[PDB]
C-alpha cells in the first residue's frame, strides 16, 4: 500500500513567515485524492486542503496546496499565531507521520532544579526523585540521571509541556523511581542537563538526609 | 449546521466488548460515508475504515480486517466502531468523521476517548516538591487512575508560572504526573503555597501546603 511520508517532523518558523510543508507518495497518485488537516493539542483534526488544490469551507486563503505524483506542498504564505499546530496529509486509507509547525524564538537555556524525595513518600517504601527543566528554547534536552558515581538507566520517566502561549517555551520534568532500600543505600543524586542554550552541561544535586 | 456527535468516555477492562456510536445531523446521513480513525496517546491518525450508512457497504483498512466491526442504523442516524475483546494496546481517541464520495473527511466527530486497563479507579497520592533569584516549588500527584487530575495553586489566585505537566504511565498501571510554579526567592517567607489537586472519578479533593525544607 502508499506510504506518505512528511518532511520535515518539525519546522520552527516565526509569526509573518512562509511555511512550506512538505508530503512525498511512495508511488505515483492521482492529486485528486490528496488532503491536508490541521490539529491543535486536544482538538479533532480538521480539514485544510482537498483534491490537492481546494481549500475547505471558511479555511483563510494564506493556505495553499499543490504538486502532483509523489509530490505534494502545503504553504501558509503568513504565518498566524493560530497556525502553530501539527498537518498531516492523506490520500486514499493513509495518512503521513505529520509535521509539528512549531514557534521559533529566541534560544532559552533551561532553569534546572532537582527535588528530593518527600518523607511522607518514603514511609510507603518508594523514593521519587524530581527534576525540573524551566522554560527551555529549543524543546531537544537531554536529562541525565546519576546515583552516587553511576549513570541510570530505566528508572526515569519523562514529560513536556506543550510551547508556551505566552514565552514559546518549554518546561520537562523527569522523575528517577527506586525503592525505599535502593535509594537509602546511596548519597549523590544528580541531575545532569544538556542544551543548545548552555555553554557546558549543568548538575544539580543532594545528599540523601543533609 | 452539520454535526458528528459522539458517545461518550469509556474506561474498559481487557477483555471486555465495545461499541461506540456516531450520530449525524444537518444533512443526508444516507448520501455520504463514515469514517473511522484512532488516534493513539502521542501518537499521529490511523485509518481504520468506512462505510456507507445508505446501502450499508463497509471497507477497513489491511491493519483493521478483521480487528473491528463498522455498522451504522440509518433509522436514527448512527454509525459503530466495536470490538469484541479489547486489549491495553487500544487505548486511543477514536474519531468518526463524514466522507464525501472523493475520499477526505470533511467534519469530524468530537472525538471517544477509549481507556483500556486491568486497574481500578484510585486517588492519587499528593507530595510536596519542597524548595538565581527565582525557587520552584510543586507536587507530585503520583499512583491514580482514570485521568485526569486538576491542579490549582492558592484557589486559582497562582497562575503565573505555573506548569502542570502532561501525566506518565507507569508499568503499574496507575498515572503519575507533577505540577510545579515558578516562584521569587525572596517571597517564601511572606507567602503560602498550597496545591489543590483534584481527581473526579475518585471524589479526591486534596490542598497540600509545600513548605521549604
Known amino acids: 500500500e502508499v506510504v506518505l511520508t512528511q518532511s520535515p517532523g518539525t519546522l520552527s518558523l516565526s509569526p509573518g513567515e512562509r511555511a512550506t510543508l512538505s508530503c512525498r507518495a511512495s508511488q505515483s497518485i492521482s492529486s485528486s485524492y490528496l488532503a491536508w488537516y490541521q490539529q491543535k493539542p486536544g482538538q479533532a483534526p480538521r480539514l485544510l486542503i482537498y483534491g490537492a488544490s481546494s481549500r475547505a469551507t471558511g479555511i483563510p486563503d494564506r493556505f495553499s496546496g499543490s504538486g502532483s505524483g509523489t509530490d505534494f506542498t502545503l504553504t501558509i504564505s503568513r504565518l498566524e499565531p493560530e497556525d502553530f499546530a501539527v498537518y498531516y496529509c492523506q490520500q486514499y486509507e493513509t495518512f503521513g507521520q505529520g509535521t509539528k509547525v512549531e514557534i521559533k524564538r529566541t534560544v532559552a537555556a533551561p532553569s534546572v532544579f532537582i527535588f528530593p524525595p518527600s518523607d511522607e513518600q518514603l514511609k510507603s517504601g518508594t523514593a521519587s526523585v524530581v527534576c525540573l527543566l524551566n522554560n527551555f528554547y529549543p524543546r531537544e534536552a537531554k536529562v541525565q540521571w546519576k546515583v552516587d558515581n553511576a549513570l541510570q538507566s530505566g528508572n526515569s520517566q519523562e514529560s513536556v509541556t506543550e510551547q508556551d502561549s505566552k514565552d514559546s517555551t518549554y518546561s520537562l520534568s523527569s522523575t528517577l523511581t527506586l525503592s525505599k532500600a535502593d535509594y537509602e543505600k546511596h548519597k549523590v543524586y544528580a541531575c545532569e542537563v544538556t542544551h543548545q542554550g548552555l555553554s557546558s552541561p549543568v548538575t544539580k544535586s543532594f545528599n540523601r538526609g543533609e | 449546521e452539520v454535526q458528528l456527535v459522539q458517545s461518550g468516555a469509556e474506561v474498559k477492562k481487557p477483555g471486555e466488548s465495545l461499541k461506540i456510536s456516531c450520530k449525524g445531523s444537518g444533512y443526508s446521513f444516507t448520501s455520504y460515508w463514515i469514517g473511522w480513525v484512532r488516534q493513539m496517546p502521542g501518537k499521529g491518525l490511523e485509518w481504520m475504515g468506512v462505510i456507507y450508512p445508505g446501502d450499508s457497504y463497509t471497507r477497513y483498512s489491511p491493519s483493521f480486517q478483521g480487528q473491528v466491526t463498522i455498522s451504522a442504523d440509518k433509522s436514527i442516524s448512527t454509525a459503530y466502531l466495536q470490538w469484541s475483546s479489547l486489549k491495553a494496546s487500544d487505548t486511543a481517541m477514536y474519531y468518526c468523521?463524514?466522507?464525501?464520495?472523493?475520499?477526505?473527511?470533511?467534519?469530524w466527530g468530537q472525538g471517544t476517548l477509549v481507556t483500556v486497563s486491568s486497574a481500578s479507579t484510585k486517588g492519587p497520592s499528593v507530595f510536596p516538591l519542597a524548595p538565581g533569584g527565582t525557587a520552584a516549588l510543586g507536587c507530585l500527584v503520583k499512583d491514580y487512575f482514570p485521568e485526569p487530575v486538576t491542579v490549582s495553586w492558592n484557589s486559582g489566585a497562582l497562575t503565573s508560572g505555573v506548569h502542570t505537566f502532561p501525566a506518565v504511565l507507569q508499568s503499574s498501571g496507575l498515572y503519575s504526573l507533577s505540577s510545579v510554579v515558578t516562584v521569587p526567592s525572596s517571597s517564601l517567607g511572606t507567602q503560602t503555597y498550597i496545591c489543590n489537586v483534584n481527581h473526579k472519578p475518585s471524589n479526591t479533593k486534596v490542598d497540600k501546603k509545600v513548605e521549604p525544607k
Open positions: 468523521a463524514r466522507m464525501p464520495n472523493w475520499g477526505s473527511f470533511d467534519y
